[PDB]
Amino acid sequence: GTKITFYEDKDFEGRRYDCDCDCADFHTYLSRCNSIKVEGGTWAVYERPDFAGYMYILPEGEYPEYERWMGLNDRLSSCRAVHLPSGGEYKIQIFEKGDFSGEMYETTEDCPSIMEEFHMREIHSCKVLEGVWIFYELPDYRGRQYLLDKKEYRKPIDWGAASPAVQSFRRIVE
């Protein structure tokens, strides 16, 4: 029962497009997106078609302007719903060095500052043991977002990053 609606203008005005599960290209129906309503569930929305470019995570809610999903602009073209397992536990292992090496830290908690908590500004590999997580380039859940749907991540490119810069992360909780 999850649904997201994109609107071409701010404040939920103008032409709109509805997605119910995974839409690899709505650019043909909307040339821009300046407000979004997320009715149920959590969604990943993407700048370019086929889930490419900058990514933004939107939990349920109303977003009357693109700044409210921390967007860079009104350019969005594809989206997929974030499917969470039940159970309700979250666990991540973050590594100082590539290929699950160097200092390891394991945590079940949101981390708004990797520097203050783990004394690193970079993550070079990672194992998500339980749940679903977001990595952020900057502290306090700012900057480039990356979605980590469990499994193992040998190198930053495996979570979509061009570099190991990660400075906060948090769980996607329904």
From Swiss-Prot:
Any GO BP: morphogenesis of an epithelium
GO molecular-function terms, A-Z: structural constituent of eye lens
Effect of D22G: In CTRCT20; uncertain significance
This protein's record includes keyword Chaperone: no
InterPro entries on file: Beta/Gamma-Crystallin, Beta/gamma_crystallin, G_crystallin-like
Domain of life: Eukaryota
UniProt KW keywords: Acetylation, Cataract, Disease variant, Eye lens protein, Repeat
Residues covered by region (Connecting peptide): 84-89
Domain Beta/gamma crystallin 'Greek key': residue ranges: 2-40, 41-83, 90-130, 131-173
Illness the protein is tied to: Cataract 20, multiple types: An opacification of the crystalline lens of the eye that frequently results in visual impairment or blindness. Opacities vary in morphology, are often confined to a portion of the lens, and may be static or progressive. In general, the more posteriorly located and dense an opacity, the greater the impact on visual function. CTRCT20 includes progressive polymorphic anterior, posterior, or peripheral cortical.
Subunit: Monomer.
Domain remark from Swiss-Prot or TrEMBL: Has a two-domain beta-structure, folded into four very similar Greek key motifs.
Functional note: Crystallins are the dominant structural components of the vertebrate eye lens.
Protein family: Belongs to the beta/gamma-crystallin family.
Protein name: Gamma-crystallin S
Organism for this UniProt entry: Homo sapiens
